[PDB]
Amino acid sequence: KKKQVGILGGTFNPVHLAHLVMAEQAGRNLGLDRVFLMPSYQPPHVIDAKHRLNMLELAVEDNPFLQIETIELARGGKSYTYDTMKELTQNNPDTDYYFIIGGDMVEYLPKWYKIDELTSMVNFVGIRRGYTTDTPYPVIWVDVPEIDISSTKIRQKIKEGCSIRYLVPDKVIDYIQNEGLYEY
Template identity: 65%
Template sequence: MPIELLTPFTKVELETTEKTTNRRQVGILGGNFNPVHNAHLVVADQVRQQLGLDAVYLMPEYQPPHVDKKETIDETHRLEMLKRAIAGVEGLGIETIELERQGISYTYDTMKLLTEKNPETDYYFIIGGDMVEYLPKWHRIDELVNLVQFVGVQRPRYKAGTSYPVIWVDVPLMDISSSMVRDFIKKGRTPNYLLPHEVLDYIEEEGLYR
């Protein structure tokens, strides 16, 4: 998979998606997914296709390692919405290691366990452009960059740059957030076309976010 990466700021140029290694290439898209929405899915699918990955797994976190604690719903709901969102979609899956471990979800700890468990797999950790500038503050970041290849995805209103090695991938910019979806529902507005209808049906069935 020839990739031209002139500087850490350069967007990736893919000449071909032909495999040049027998190792498995897997993307990880972590998040709270409260709820999962269409921008999450577009990012996961486009990164998989453009980098020629075998799969991209959406990885729901149990407890975000943020200073400002975010309220979330029970992980059983978030996991069920993810299952419904990707049902039948080629190349997308779910990684539940952080829900199984519980506690604070530090990316370094998680990826260390995954790489030890799957030594034949190369991991590509996908982050939004808004998160790239915070990489220096990530837990054990200098060790983490040796475990995974970071993949950056541009987001509206964010101009990203970093000294860390990041492969940039262009995807359609969709200014959708989970907080937007929750706010729509709280105000009695139906967030049609912002998330899969299977997820919206589940939210209505369970009376979530009201």
């Protein structure tokens, strides 16, 4: 009757193999029906929203099990996760949402806006690591091999002309190089 859907949030600037492993392992190990990669809005701070989404589409293109949730992108401003999750549950009242975060983030949970309303609204899912676990917050946990790739390391490897093969999907690399992204 009700669907089980994971949500993985991030800047995805760019998407890299750590996002895919995290999203596929979390969702498949728990038995979820799908995982959505949910890019956050980033203000002109002076790439583009289209390039991040293009890259994210190329990345999950051959995988019916991973998909793109664009609601935060479409809002044209910063969002609190409560407001995002309030509208998505209102849109999909038949969905149990599983909101996936890394073991290294469960500490800052009390610093989330309306974190209390939010935990009643979604199922929080932690990625085990070394932190122990043992959180007073209603988190369930799942094992993911840890992949120490972040999108800020990818951009400066690119900025410095270092290899990113295997760290970032072949198509995504290809899009980056053929669009001049992150060069400077």
